[PDB]
Amino acid sequence: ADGPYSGILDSVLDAIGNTPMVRMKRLAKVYGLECDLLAKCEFMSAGGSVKDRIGKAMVEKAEREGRLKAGDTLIEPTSGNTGIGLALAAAVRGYRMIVTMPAKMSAEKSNIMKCLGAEIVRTPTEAAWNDENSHMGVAAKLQRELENAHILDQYNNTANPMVHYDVTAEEIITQCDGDIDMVVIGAGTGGTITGIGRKIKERCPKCKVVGVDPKGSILAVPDSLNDEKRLQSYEVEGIGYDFVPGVLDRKVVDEWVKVGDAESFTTARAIIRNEGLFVGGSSGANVWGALQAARQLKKGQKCVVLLPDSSRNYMSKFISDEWMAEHGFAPEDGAKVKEREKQFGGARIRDLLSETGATSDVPFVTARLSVEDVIKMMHETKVKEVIVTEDSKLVGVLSEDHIAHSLQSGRCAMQSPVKDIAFKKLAKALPSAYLRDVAKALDFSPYVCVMDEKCPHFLGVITRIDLLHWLATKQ
């Protein structure tokens, strides 16, 4: 029906939470998991992360205790999501935001908190928690040097675990109808795992609770699990620290799973590909840990996994296959990159142009010929396409179809230069380039034009249907 959203909302703050639970049947079938793998899609909140709840809640606690008045300044150390939540709460309720975040965190978080009118001071990645150049020490310094400033200190404030104990765990219970057998949840601030696991074990003591920790952190128990990469910086953002936060009750969690960067990212891409959940990397870590932990479960039992972040914050980082190749991470089992590498291999455009049959007789024009002259030349040469170029270095491609239709549409004068109607988006290539690379370039450019670049004697233009016909010649 319609109970929570059947009305109009006073502000975006009331749109936090109420996130659905989806069954990852396809992903379980992919990885061969018998039980029901349920996913709590926290990234569908207003700000696209679970920490929005605690942001709103810490603001509510600061307001119910009268410790907060309009015009004040809020300071908060964060990996990026709590900064977003508190920036939302401030832009709504009229507070000033100052965010401290390590340089390791993505740039999208910074851009978004800048759009939200929040000041951003960054800290070095390698700084330990004891350093005054850590985000927490710098936040303390800003509190000491700024007037009317407040730190909510998500690492030690009780609102962070108490709210996941109050509403989120109750949401999971109400939608799972009490039947929860395993709960896999990342260990960042530790507030969400503490709260959720505490409430669940109170209302379902038979439920196991598994925590996810990236290889590099010291949050796992025992210390035999941390020695993989002790205090080695990792790419996964949001989870793991070099110290135990104040809100983390490591006794409420039963098992611990260490997860590396590669598995986290490849599993995040697998989630996106197989379920269609635009999710973050920490969620890949959580789901990989869940797949490792709930293997022994049987059908009917439900393993609940948290999906903390959206792809929005890592859109440029790991959604782009370029950056994952730069860091050498397995793309996915079934991915477009592996598909292209399988079909093309090292086949270069020389091979395609040779097997197809061309003589590099692509006409050229100085890009300011009148369209009358260029159509006379096109009709005298019988070609359909032409390439326009300048003297100071390419302009683009131009076809007779666009000529006619633009002349009819009133955008192409007879005396106008051909540069005005040519296609200006182009991708330059050279015969040594592989077919996989031109396939990746076709994802962003409609045509791909070749050149020798030794005279500028281009041999032809390449489009996706050309590669499709070439693959039709193969099998």
Ligand X SMILES: C=C(NCc1c(COP(=O)(O)O)cnc(C)c1O)C(=O)O
DSSP string, 405-417: HHHHHT---TTSB
Q: Does 437 contact its own copies by CB under 8 A? A: no
Among the listed ranges 180-188, 224-232, 318-326, 349-357, the one in contact with ligand X (CB under 6 A) is 180-188
Q: Does 316 contact its own copies by CB under 8 A? A: yes
Q: Does 266 contact ligand X by CB under 6 A? A: no
Q: Is 94 annotated as a binding residue?
A: no
Q: Name the residue type at position 187.
A: A
Strands 461-462 and 448-450: antiparallel
Could you tell me if residue 398 is left (phi over 0), alpha (psi between -120 and 50 degrees) or otherwise beta? beta
Close Cβ partners of 329 (under 8 Å, ≥ 6 residues apart): 261, 262, 265, 266, 318
Task: List the interface residues with ligand X, window 82-101 (CB under 6 A).
Answer: 82
Nearest distance from residue 350's CB to ligand X, in Å? 37
What values do phi and psi take at 214, rounded to 5? -70, 145
Q: How far, in whole angstroms, is CA 474 from its chain's centroid? A: 35
Q: Does 168 contact its own copies by CB under 8 A? A: no
Q: Decide which of ligand X, its own copies, none touches 280; Cβ closer than 5 to 8 Å per partner kind.
A: ligand X
Tokens read off for 350: 């020389």
Q: Which of 431, 437, 423, 435 is nearest to 394 (CA)?
A: 423
Q: Does 135 contact ligand X by CB under 6 A? A: no
Q: Name which position in 102, 186, 289, 396 contacts ligand X (CB under 6 A).
A: 186
Among the listed ranges 67-75, 201-209, 284-292, 409-417, the one in contact with its own copies (CB under 8 A) is 409-417
CA distance 12 to 166: 20
> At 251, is the secondary structure helix, strand, or coil?
coil
Task: List the interface residues with its own copies, window 115-134 (CB under 8 A).
Answer: 115-117, 119-128, 130-133
Buried b (16+ CB within 10 A) or exposed e, 36-59: bbbbbbbbbbbbbbbbbbbbbbbb
Task: List the interface residues with its own copies, window 171-190 (CB under 8 A).
Answer: 171, 174-176
Q: Does 192 contact ligand X by CB under 6 A? A: yes
Q: Does 309 contact ligand X by CB under 6 A? A: yes
Q: Does the annotation count 51 as an active-site position?
A: yes
Nearest distance from residue 293's CB to its own copies, in Å? 20
Q: Name the residue type at position 55.
A: G
Close Cβ partners of 407 (under 8 Å, ≥ 6 residues apart): 371, 414
Q: Is 188 annotated as a binding residue?
A: yes
Q: Is 224 annotated as a binding residue?
A: no
Q: Name the residue type at position 87.
A: A
Q: Decide which of its own copies, ligand X, none touches 46; Cβ closer than 5 to 8 Å per partner kind.
A: its own copies
CA distance 163 to 39: 19
Q: Name which position in 19, 100, 157, 282 contacts ligand X (CB under 6 A).
A: 282
CA distance 47 to 28: 28
Close Cβ partners of 326 (under 8 Å, ≥ 6 residues apart): none
Q: With CB under 6 A, what is the number of residues at the site for ligand X?
A: 22
Task: List the interface residues with ligand X, window 222-241 (CB under 6 A).
Answer: 238-239
Q: Is 266 annotated as a binding residue?
A: no
Q: Does 163 contact ligand X by CB under 6 A? A: no
Q: Name which position in 39, 187, 349, 467 contacts ligand X (CB under 6 A).
A: 187
Q: Name the residue type at position 351.
A: D
Of the residues 51, 109, 199, 215, only one is catalytic, namely: 51
Active site residues: 51
- Which residues participate in the annotated binding site for pyridoxal 5'-phosphate? 81, 188-190, 192, 282
Binding region for ligand X (CB under 6 A): 49, 51, 78-82, 154, 186-193, 238-239, 280, 282, 308-309
